[PDB]
Design a protein around this nucleic acid. Sequence first.
DNA 1: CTGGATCCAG
DNA 2: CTGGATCCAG
Length: 246
Amino acid sequence: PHMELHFNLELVETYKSNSQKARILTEDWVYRQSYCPNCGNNPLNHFPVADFYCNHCSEEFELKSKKGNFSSTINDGAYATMMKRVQADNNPNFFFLTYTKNFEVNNFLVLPKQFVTPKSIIQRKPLAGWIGCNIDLSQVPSKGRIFLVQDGQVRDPEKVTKEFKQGLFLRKSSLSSRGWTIEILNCIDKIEGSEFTLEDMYRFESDLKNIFVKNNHIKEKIRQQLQILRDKEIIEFKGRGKYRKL
DNA sequence: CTGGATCCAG
DNA sequence: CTGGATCCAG
Ligand SMILES: [Zn+2]
Ligand SMILES: [Zn+2]
C-alpha cells in the first residue's frame, strides 16, 4: 500500500476548462487514495454530493476541498441548515482536502462528526437575508482534526485510527456535556509542552465562564473533565494536581 | 487546605 | 438524564 499524493494528471488534462474539474479531481483522489480513519478499510464506497461511506464499519464522510493555502475555515452552506444538523447530531464526518497548483494533496484530514459544535459554526459575510457559514477549525481541538496527510507528509494509518477511536466516546455525550469536554481539550491544546498543572487549567476559568454562562462551579467542572480525559487515556494523572498529555 | 469522586432537582 | 452542584479522602 502506497498513497499517491497527486491527482490523476490525465484527468487534469481531459477536464481542462470544464466547470466540474475541481470536483471530479478531488472526489477521484479520495475514492482511490483515502482509507476509513475508523477501521482502516480501503477503498471507501461512493454513496451530486461528494459523500463516501465505509462498507466495513458504516462510517460516513462528506468531502470539502480548498485549492492552495491551508485555511483555518472550511466553507459550508446555509447557517440555519448547518445548525439544525449540528443540533440534531446529524452531520456526517467531514473530510477536508487542500491541494496545490500542481494538483498535489498537501493536507487531508478528518473532522469526526461529534467535534462539530454550534460554536465551531461561524457566519460567512453575514447579511441581516443571506447568511452562509464555515466550520472554524480553530474551535476544534487537535483530537477532532485528524490528519491522514499533513504538510505533504503521509501519516501512519495506525495513529489515525487510534486517534479517531479515542474520540468516539464523545458521541455518547449530549450537546452541552460534549461541549464541556471539547472546550477542555481546546484549553489543553493551548498549554505549551507535555506537562501541565491544575493551576495551568484554572487560568482558563474566565474564558470557560464566558462559554458556559450558567456554571458557577467552573474549577470543579475542570477537575471532573480532566478525570473523564484520564479515563479515556487522553491525559494521565501524575497525582496532586499534575498531569501529562498522552 | 487541595483536588479526585460523586451526585441530584427538575 | 442532564450539567451545574456537592461530596469526601489525604
Ligand atoms: Zn505524485
Ligand atoms: Zn471503516
